[PDB]
Amino acid sequence: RKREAEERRRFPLEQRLKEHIIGQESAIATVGAAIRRKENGWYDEEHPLVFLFLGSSGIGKTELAKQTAKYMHKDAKKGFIRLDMSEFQERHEVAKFIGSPPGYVGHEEGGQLTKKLKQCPNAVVLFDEVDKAHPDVLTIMLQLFDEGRLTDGKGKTIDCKDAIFIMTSNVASDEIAQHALQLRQEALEISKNFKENVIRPILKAHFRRDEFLGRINEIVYFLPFCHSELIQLVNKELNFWAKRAKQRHNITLLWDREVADVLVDGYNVHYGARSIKHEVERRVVNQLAAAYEQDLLPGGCTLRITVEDSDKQLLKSPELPSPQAEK
């Protein structure tokens, strides 16, 4: 008890997530508060904890879910359960949850989800892209979210009252991103309850049933990044590549402050972080790989990126001559 409490206080989940997620402070704060509430025993054991993650594309929803799963279960693969709801676009596909009835092909195998949950009753379940499921498939989750009960095709009931369920979608993402015009309001010169009652009609229009929505403990809103968070993302990506280069080939990598400013221009609000990822890859790592194959990067050398309308690489001082693949 004492060691767990001391470790949690010393290195909170919220500080652990911040290492991997940039921004999203209100989502981090909500998930951390719920998690901490559960861990300290201040939770009802009858009803499992359920989250729904909403916002635009590529802003860390599945990332946050993965980090939460890793934190809850340090490494156990069975502790984290993935479900790509995009494979459940038809009603009949719900059989994958619980398996076929008696007398039907595949009956001897129980429900896949039932088996997975049985292997780890307190696992973290991620229904990714839940809006891509057929809405009759979501009906199977009514008892799962209310009481953590699920009966396979063989009549065996699974108890998962202590599990944590996370759903992710971008259902209201235009309306959430449009409400980030509150960042543009500049009053000196974050989502309101009444906005959540404008985001509701959209949720019921998609997720047809009020008894489904009334089962979720928390709706988490992920906002579009502000300019500083874009700079942080670019720096994070460059640091990742620098670490990889240093580890693999002992190459030291440096970049001026203006490199991030140049790179952020590739940001696409419709795609989020992955846009920055692709931009950095395309217009830095391509040059890096071309130089490496050309053998212009001796082990232990120092490479610094300089800023033009394009990006140049200096081998500790001289400009590295760009190789010619076409010869």
Ligand X SMILES: Nc1ncnc2c1ncn2[C@@H]1O[C@H](COP(=O)(O)OP(=O)(O)O)[C@@H](O)[C@H]1O
The listed partner (ligand X, a second copy, Mg ion, none) that binds 21, CB under 5 to 8 Å by sort, is ligand X
The DSSP annotation for 74-143 comes to: SS-GGGEEEEEGGG--SGGGGHHHH-PPTTSTTTTS--HHHHHHHH-TT-EEEEETGGGS-TTTGGGHHH
The smaller minimum CB distance to ligand AGS, of residues 275 and 287, is found at: 275
The reply to whether 170 sits in an annotated binding site is: yes
Q: Which residues contact 103 (CB under 8 A, 6 or more apart)?
A: none
Of residues 195, 225, 116, the one with CA closest to residue 163? 116
* Least distance between a second copy and beta carbon 183 (Å): 19
Spatial separation of the C-alpha atoms in residues 56 and 183, rounded to whole Å? 16
Residue 218 in contact with residue 30, Cβ under 8 Å? Answer: yes
Spatial separation of the C-alpha atoms in residues 77 and 57, rounded to whole Å? 26
30 is an interface residue for Mg ion by CB under 5 A? no
291 is an interface residue for ligand AGS by CB under 6 A? no
The DSSP annotation for 211-276 comes to: HHHTT-SEEEEEPPPPHHHHHHHHHHHHHHHHHHHHHHH--EEEE-HHHHHHHHTT--TTTTHHHH
State the binding string over 178-197 for a second copy (x if CB under 8 A, else -): ------------------xx
The listed partner (a second copy, ligand X, ligand AGS, none) that binds 188, CB under 5 to 8 Å by sort, is none
62 is an interface residue for Mg ion by CB under 5 A? yes
The reply to whether 257 sits in an annotated binding site is: no
The listed partner (ligand AGS, a second copy, ligand X, none) that binds 224, CB under 5 to 8 Å by sort, is none
* Least distance between ligand AGS and beta carbon 147 (Å): 8
The residue from 31, 35, 50, 59 that contacts ligand X (CB under 6 A) is: 59
* Least distance between ligand AGS and beta carbon 272 (Å): 6
Start-to-end C-alpha separation, the chain: 66
Spatial separation of the C-alpha atoms in residues 288 and 305, rounded to whole Å? 10
The region of 107-115, 148-156, 183-191, 267-275 touching ligand X under the rule CB under 6 A is 267-275
Residue count at the site for ligand X (CB under 6 A)? 15
Residue number of the CB atom closest to ligand X: 60
The smaller minimum CB distance to Mg ion, of residues 125 and 320, is found at: 125
The residue from 1, 74, 248, 257 that contacts a second copy (CB under 8 A) is: 248
- What are 48's two structure tokens? 């499992």
- What are 104's two structure tokens? 């039907």
Other CB atoms within 10 Å distance of the CB of residue 188:
4
102 is an interface residue for a second copy by CB under 8 A? yes
The reply to whether 243 sits in an annotated binding site is: no
Question: Which residues are known binding-site members for ATP?
Answer: 20, 22, 57-62, 129, 170, 215, 274
Interface contacts to ligand X, rule CB under 6 A: 20-22, 57-63, 128, 168, 272-274
**Residue ranges in contact with ligand AGS by CB under 6 A:** 21-24, 57-63, 129, 168, 170, 211, 214, 233, 272-274
